[PDB]
Amino acid sequence: XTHCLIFQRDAVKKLQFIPKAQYPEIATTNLAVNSELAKLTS
Amino acid sequence: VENPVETFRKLIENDSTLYMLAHSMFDEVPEKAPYDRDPTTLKKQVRNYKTMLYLFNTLLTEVPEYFLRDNPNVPSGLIGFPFNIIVDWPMGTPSGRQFFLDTRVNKCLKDILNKWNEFLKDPTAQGNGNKGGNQALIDAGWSSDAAVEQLVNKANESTTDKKKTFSEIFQHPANGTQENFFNYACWDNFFTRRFKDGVRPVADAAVVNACESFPLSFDTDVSRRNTFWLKGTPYSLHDMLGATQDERVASYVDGFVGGSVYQAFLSADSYHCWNAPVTGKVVYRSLIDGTYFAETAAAGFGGSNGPDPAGPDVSQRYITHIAARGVLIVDTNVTGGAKIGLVGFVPVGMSEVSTCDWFDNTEEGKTISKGDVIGAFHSGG
Numbered sequence: 433x434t435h436c437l438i439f440q441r442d443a444v445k446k447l448q449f450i451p452k453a454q455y456p457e458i459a460t461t462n463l464a465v466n467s468e469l470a471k472l473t474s
Numbered sequence: 475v476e477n478p479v480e481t482f483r484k485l486i487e488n489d490s491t492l493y494m495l496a497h498s499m500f501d502e503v504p505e506k507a508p509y510d511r512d513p514t515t516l517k518k519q520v521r522n523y524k525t526m527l528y529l530f531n532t533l534l535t536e537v538p539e540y541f542l543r544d545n546p547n548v549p550s551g552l553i554g555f556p557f558n559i560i561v562d563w564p565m566g567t568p569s570g571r572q573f574f575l576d577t578r579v580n581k582c583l584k585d586i587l588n589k590w591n592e593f594l595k596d597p598t599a600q601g602n603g604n605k606g607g608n609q610a611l612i613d614a615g616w617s618s619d620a621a622v623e624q625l626v627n628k629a630n631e632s633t634t635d636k637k638k639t640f641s642e643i644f645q646h647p648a649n650g651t652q653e654n655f656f657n658y659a660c661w662d663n664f665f666t667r668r669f670k671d672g673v674r675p676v677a678d679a680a681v682v683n684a685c686e687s688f689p690l691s692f693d694t695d696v697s698r699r700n701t702f703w704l705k706g707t708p709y710s711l712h713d714m715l716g717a718t719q720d721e722r723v724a725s726y727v728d729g730f731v732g733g734s735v736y737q738a739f740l741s742a743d744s745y746h747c748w749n750a751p752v753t754g755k756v757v758y759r760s761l762i763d764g765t766y767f768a769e770t771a772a773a774g775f776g777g778s779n780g781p782d783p784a785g786p787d788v789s790q791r792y793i794t795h796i797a798a799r800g801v802l803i804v805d806t807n808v809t810g811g812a813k814i815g816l817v818g819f820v821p822v823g824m825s826e827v828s829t830c831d832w833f834d835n836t837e838e839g840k841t842i843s844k845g846d847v848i849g850a851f852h853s854g855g
């Protein structure tokens with residue numbers, strides 16, 4: 433296996449995580465490594 | 475150079491309290507079905523520590539068995555985990571929990587599982603010919619249609635660009651076919667296999683997924699230190715990042731107060747390497763010794779979500795604070811970086827997949843690029 437990614441408070445304000453990651457109960461499969469996890473919004 | 479299983483035997487027998495726990499953690503497993511059998515249901519449950527040591531010694535020269543070939547319908551959560559299968563129910567007892575929290579026990583377990591890792595990366599399978607490591611995988615069922623399809627299907631489930639065959643997905647040695655199990659020379663090379671070029675393209679986004687993994691938790695506004703033992707397991711940065719034992723990481727703990735923690739699970743049939751989630755300069759890297767088979771009370775017998783048939787699956791947030799793990803902290807406020815401050819990556823072992831292997835490109839002072847392979851889990855301690 434398991435792992436964590438950790439982000440700073442001011443960075444999280446600037447980022448948009450994909451729903452499958454921010455709301456894990458909705459996920460039904462693996463996320464692909466190297467695929468998008470969060471994008472900058474500002 | 476003593477047999478690490480023999481060192482473990484002596485630890486148990488030469489300490490009165492561990493001797494007591496090593497009996498009680500088995501006595502506390504109910505005799506009644508389903509617990510007369512291990513969680514796979516394929517074998518009788520082990521009921522004493524001497525049979526346990528005997529089996530552990532035997533496993534030092536075995537690769538995990540793909541038992542789903544001849545038994546496709548039994549519980550499959552412990553595929554790849556022969557040690558985990560033996561101690562799963564003991565893990566769930568009060569005495570078992572105390573036993574697997576003991577630091578001397580976990581040093582002995584580390585040495586046992588690292589000795590196992592030596593065999594799993596040995597292409598001779600401890601002296602059985604130059605193709606021994608490969609043949610052991612075929613003998614263990616890993617080239618069966620069932621295993622290969624499970625690996626192919628698991629890799630395809632995360633992408634729309636699906637491939638028909640294993641060789642279109644994962645790198646393996648030359649002239650690899652299913653019949654020769656892709657000419658993988660040992661378990662370790664199959665376990666840490668890489669994706670073929672372009673099968674996992676690096677997205678444009680500022681953060682990409684570090685692991686081929688199943689989302690588990692996303693917590694916001696986390697604390698410096700928290701009561702990670704209470705129901706729900708609030709994350710405790712101070713404990714998770716090892717500020718307990720390394721004052722050097724304390725400033726990063728403080729810098730993550732109020733930040734967010736995202737956690738995801740890597741299945742046995744998933745890609746097990748680590749890729750860089752961001753571009754930046756490594757400012758801190760550590761390895762942290764800890765537990766292997768420690769799970770929550772809630773995951774044990776009589777627990778509100780126990781006994782876990784595949785501990786520590788339902789204790790994943792808990793073990794981030796005590797299991798064998800590693801820490802990587804990347805500074806993205808650098809040229810070519812996304813300018814989102816410090817990003818932490820905490821791979822956390824589970825059971826006998828607890829070897830945290832940082833690649834040399836992650837040394838402190840170096841710059842990693844988003845999507846680079848930076849390490850891997852291995853079977854081992």
Ligand SMILES: *NCCCCNC(=N)N
Nearest residue numbers: 433434784785786824825
């Ligand atoms: N993260 C590696 C897979 C761990 C599977 N669960 C378990 N061994 N209980």
